[PDB]
Structures are given as structure tokens and as C-alpha cells.
Design a protein around this ligand. Structure first.
Ligand code: ZN
Lengths: 101, 43
RNA sequence: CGAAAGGGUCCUGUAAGCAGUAGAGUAGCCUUGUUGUUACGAUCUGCUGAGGGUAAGCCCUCCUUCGCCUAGAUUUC
RNA sequence: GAAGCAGAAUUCGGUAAGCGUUGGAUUGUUCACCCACUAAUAGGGAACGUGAGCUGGGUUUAGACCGUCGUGAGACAGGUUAGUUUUACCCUACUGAUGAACUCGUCGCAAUGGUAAUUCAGCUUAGUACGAGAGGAACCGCUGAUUCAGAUAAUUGGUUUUU
RNA sequence: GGUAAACGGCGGGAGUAACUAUGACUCUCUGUAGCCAAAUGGAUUAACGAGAUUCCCACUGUCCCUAUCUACUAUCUAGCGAAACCACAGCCAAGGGAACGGGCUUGGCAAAAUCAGCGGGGAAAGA
RNA sequence: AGGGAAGUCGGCAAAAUAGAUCCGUAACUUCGGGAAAAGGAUUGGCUCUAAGGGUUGGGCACGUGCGUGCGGUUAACAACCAACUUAGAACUGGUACGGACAGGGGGAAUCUGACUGUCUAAUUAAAACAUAGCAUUGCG
RNA sequence: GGAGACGACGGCGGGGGCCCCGGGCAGAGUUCUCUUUUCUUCUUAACGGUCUAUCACCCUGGAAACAGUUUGUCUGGAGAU
RNA sequence: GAAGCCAGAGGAAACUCUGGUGGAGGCUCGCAGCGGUUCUGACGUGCAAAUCGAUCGUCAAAUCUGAGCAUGGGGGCGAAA
């Protein structure tokens, strides 16, 4: 079930994208900037329990561990294993390239 | 924040309701639920 | 002029069916495991930007077909 | 038009109603004052010299409570709560739409009625005139925007019984 | 004579010379969390409520600021077919002493027959 | 769309929430409650795995299917039969998985009546009435 | 003296009927493909006979190492198992 | 999820704790029924001299309801409007 499914596609209800999550997994600096754009005291569990793949904060370590067994986390893992869609893949799909000399 | 987390005064996402807890504290102060007094000046 | 059709342009998103050393596993038959084999099995892959719709206020078509036609009635310095 | 009005910003006055004159907070209350935006947030009438648009307060049928008065029924210095009016198809006015008589039709004229635009900013002038300094314009020229008005659907959004 | 001492009245406390009611006449009166009570010192009363009120998050066409779609109407046709109401009628302006004009005076004006709407006026509230 | 009560006397109306499994749940309290408080994690399909049952049935010596006198509690075994729940795992589609339907918004407080209940059929459902409890009066 | 003759609620057990599953004969439908398929009939009254069915009651005997026993803790030297 | 009951762990005992069992209540969500809160609701010469829609209260009892019978205007009946 999705909370308030009617307005789910609004920009003010937007969630973090899969390629951003891929860059977060590859580079801790990217994740650090994303976490800097938030306030730690307003986060669940003071921000101590975070799932990078789902880009989600949890209230406790047991909550995070229990979430890992669910199918949404496994869907995110399968999507990351398949690979996020990027501008490089979009360019390769039409056979376009970048000439830098 | 600690009073909000202890009393369960949480918004969506577990964020503490600091506004409501402050209103509770002010009401308790005004309505004689927290002890306080102004001591008399010494002669 | 009308009704079909064809071509275009748009919309959706890959039809039915068949096949596959794709498929978690399970059960039989025997070479008792050497894709052992056969059977079933969401799904996946191929045939397949396929199938379906398209003017109802979309476009083109003497030269893709079939049909219709010089009326009838009323009135008028 | 006038003012020690240098410039800038103004102040007092004259003609002028063409054109505008906003968004909010606050009901432990004469709801009036605060806040901001702005060119500016001017004042009135057509009701209030009784009076069927909608809907809140003065406001008040029947139920109920508290306060004051009263022997009481009840009344009030009062305070609170809940509570029935429910057209339009008529005439006129208004907005649109047809139309007889003059054969039918095409192209026109224009009496009369209506009438429409508005304000700000930026560039240049110019760091110039003016000024001890701090500061600091305007005419001509150029480009946008505010409010209003009349259209439109290439594009972007919205709408889906194309069921 | 005694009181439910109910209503009611009722600032206290001392004295006296009165001597009983009514007295009467003087005097003067301002612990930053304790102690005491049979853990508590409470009505700042829990639960419950289609009771009245203020606020917060979420939420959204309540609004900025409106747009679009569907069904049934309204519409047009065939059939069927009322009622309310009705002195007479229905364009205005100024005047018409009794603060009222639709009819009068003086002007503006003013062209058949009609249909959909509308809610200024007239009508319209078991008013 | 974007904003999110700027609307309005007033969030009126609408929207949001909603089933089930699991984690967790404050003040206050008449200790019974508050409580589904609050705040979170999850849910499809397919292929499997595991757990939870019923019935029947024991060896000798005699008399002759029963009677004894014995002997034994690994039947802890076989045969047959049967239904619905619960938990665990892999695989797999996805914008949705209580996919329609059905289905609490929640919270901080104040006033108020103890509660359940009842009335003004046809304008008032309430702090009104009743209620248990308490108190007084009359009567042998 | 008995019957007539008696409240409300809760779970448990037995019986009838209904619902559900499997096989078989017959009939019907489906059939591009699949489907030994999907659906329909297959019943037995009152009244009687006969054999049985919880409670309870009777006989033997005398229970502590207490036992029997319901989902629900009741029963037994006033005689249980 | 109240009494009552079973087991385990303690405690000299009284009792305490843990896990079950059980199924109480003018308890609670909610279907029918009964009722009638709200809506600038529909309707307003109506389907109706009180109806319709959504929403709402209650739903094991101070619940709903039939028939028979009793109380009659100086009256009755009244959880009292
Ligand atoms: Zn995750």
C-alpha cells in the first residue's frame, strides 16, 4: 500500500532516483552531500539507521534488519544488479558518442 | 526533543513534535503542574 | 456525392499460436546420473515497434471498387 | 503656480473623476487597529430619511443551565447552548435568438448608440548637469513588465465514454 | 416552654455597676519545598459523549483560478396535461404641499408576431 | 499543474486514514483502563520445504472362537485413511500487490454531564430527564 | 405422586437436512487446440417390527505411591477406579 | 479478556512471578433491526399534510416487536417535553 496514492506523482512527493543511489553506493562523497542536504534531528532514529539502496531512514536497527528481508529491498537490489539507466546508456542506444579530441 | 521522544509526541517519520511539547510545558507551568515561585526580598 | 478499401498520420505497447540444452524446484522411468531422461512449472527469449484502433469535427486517392443523379412538393412584384 | 525648491527627495496650492485604488493577521468584541506589497492603497452616494438576492452579528417563539430579583407563577443588570418559509412557467426590464409586409439575391453606405487602455521598471542620456562632500536628475532614443481588454491552440500543462 | 435550627440573622475577644431575657458602659484586635495528620493531603475527579471551544501534523479545487468529462434534466418532437395568481393594465425622466404614483402635467420617445434565458421592478411567504 | 486554508463567522465540504501479520505504544487513572494511543516494517504470483492427525494389529502351555496360568512394555513398529491451518525458502512480474469491493485520520488541551439509558411523532437529542449512591420525613 | 409445566446466555457432543469431494450407468453441452471433460437424474413418508444409542441406576470389591476425568475441575469409604 | 482452574519457578507458610485454560461485562468495532446527528444536500402546488440520499447513534440489553387485556377528558398516561 502507498500512502496517498492520488498525489504520488507530484514533484513535492518525489523520491531519490536509482542512478543517484548507484552513485551513492560507489562514492561516499555523493552520499555525504545528499545527507548534508537533510537535518539529522528530524530523521528517524537520528539518522543512524539508513538503507542506501532504498534511500530510506529507519527508526531502529531491528527495523532496518527486518526491512532487508522484504521484497521492496530485494526489488531495489535486483534493479541495482540490472543497472540504472543513465545518459551514457541513452547515448549508446542511438549510437551517438562524445568527441573530445 | 527528549520529552517528545519519551512521550511519543512524534510527527510523520518519527520527527519530534517540539511545538506541541513546548505548548504542554507552558501549560503545565501556568496551571500549577511544575513547582516554581518568586522568593521574597530579604529585609 | 455517398459507402467501402488502400496509402499516410497519429495512439497504445509487442497479438493469438508454436518453439526453446532459458526457468526456482518437484515427481516418475531407467544408463542411477555423466544438460541422465521425461512430465509439470509463475516467468523469460524468438517469430513480433508486433497486434489492435484511427474521424466519429485527421489527411490523400479521375488513374482501388460498388452505388446515386437533370427530382418531388410549396410559394413568388 | 509658489517655497533655500543646488541636485535628489519633497511641502503648500490650482485644473482635472480619463485611469487605478491591493493582499493578510487579529472576535477574552462597539472588530477597530496593526503588518506588508504598491504608483497609490482617497472619501462618499445609489439601503441605513422602515422594508423578499445568499449568508454571519444587534436578535429576542417553543427545550435547557447559571447569575440578579421575586413567597411564587415568573421577570430580568445579565451570561451560555440548540433551534422550519420552501417563487418564477406571468407582465415589464435586461441578455441573446427568429422574423411578416417591399420579387429573390450580391456588393456597399453610415444616422444613431457604444467606445479603451493603464501603470511601473530597466538600458542610454550619465556617475553627466548640480554639488564642499555625501550623493545625483531630465527631454529625444531603446527594451521589458503590472493591471485591463480582445483573440488563439503551433507548443507545454489539465481534462478522457476515443471506453 | 423546647428546636429541622430549615429559612434567617451573625466582625471578634475581655470584663463588670446591671444581675434572668434584650443587657448597657468601658477596654483593645492586625520549606526552592515545612509541619502535622491513617500511602495520601484530592473538585486541576479517570473512563464515556452525533454535547460547546482553541490549536498542531497529515490532507486536499476551501482559495489563487478556473478548466474539463459522464448520467439525468432543462431543450425540440408525438401523446397527455394542471395550479398559484389575476380591479384594469404594464418603457422611462422631472413635477404632482399631506416626503406616494402606473393612469394626471411637461418632456424623452414610440413599429407586427415571436423563442431560450434571467432574477432589477411589479407580482410571489398557509406574510 | 504549482502552491497548500492564503478561502470562510467557522477546514463547511472534499481529500487523506482504513483489512490482516509483526515491532512498538506517553501523560493521566477510580489500577479496571487510556490503547487500534502515538510512531514504524510488511502484503501479488509460482515452485517447494517443515510442523500440527485418525483407525487397526502382539508371544507361549493346556481345555477348546473363547477361558485360564503365565510371560513383555522399542507397537519407539507396520498397514490403511484423512482435512485444514501455521511457519520457513528460492524463483519471478511490477507504475499498483487488503490492486475492485470492503474499510479508524491522528494528536494537545479547556468547558460540561459520572457512565449505559430516555424526551419535545412534524423546527430544539442537550449541561434537560432518569440512574445507582447519599440524606431527610411519616407510619406498629 | 408424576406428566401437562415453562428464564436468558456460553462453549462442547450426537442425529436429520443442506453444502462439499470421489467412482459408476444413462442423457446433454463443449471440442481451432485442450479437456478419460463440464452439467443433470440416482429418491424413500406416516405407521410398525427388530438391533442399538450420553445421563442415571444395580452387583462384586474396598482406593494414599490418591485415583478417575471435561475444551471448561469436578467426582469418590455417603463406596471411586 | 473478569472470577474459577492446570502446570512450572520461588517463598517456613501466607503469598509472589511466568505460561496456559476459561469466557464475565446495562464492555467494545460492526451486518440486519430500532433510532434520527450532520449536509448553504434532493424535494418545497412533493413519491410523501414530514418523503428521498449520503453520513451518523445503538446493536445481547433500561434491545426490538405481534396479539390479548387495563387506564378515559374536572380524566388518563408521563425516564417531566
Ligand atoms: Zn532497503
Amino acid at each position: 500500500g502507498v500512502f496517498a496514492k492520488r498525489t504520488m506523482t507530484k514533484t513535492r512527493r518525489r523520491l531519490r532516483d536509482l542512478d543517484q543511489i548507484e552513485r551513492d553506493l560507489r562514492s561516499p562523497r555523493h552520499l555525504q552531500q545528499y545527507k548534508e542536504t537533510k537535518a539529522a534531528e528530524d530523521l528517524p532514529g537520528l539518522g543512524l539507521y539508513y538503507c542506501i539502496e532504498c534511500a530510506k531512514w529507519f527508526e531502529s536497527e531491528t527495523s532496518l534488519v527486518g526491512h532487508r528481508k522484504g521484497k521492496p529491498h530485494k526489488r531495489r537490489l535486483k534493479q541495482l544488479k540490472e543497472g540504472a539507466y543513465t545518459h551514457e546508456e541513452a547515448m549508446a542506444a542511438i549510437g551517438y558518442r562524445i568527441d573530445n579530441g | 526533543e527528549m520529552l517528545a521522544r519519551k512521550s511519543g509526541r512524534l510527527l510523520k517519520g518519527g520527527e519530534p513534535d517540539v511545538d506541541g511539547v513546548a505548548k504542554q510545558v507552558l501549560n503545565d507551568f501556568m496551571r500549577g503542574k511544575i513547582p516554581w515561585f518568586t522568593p521574597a526580598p530579604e529585609p
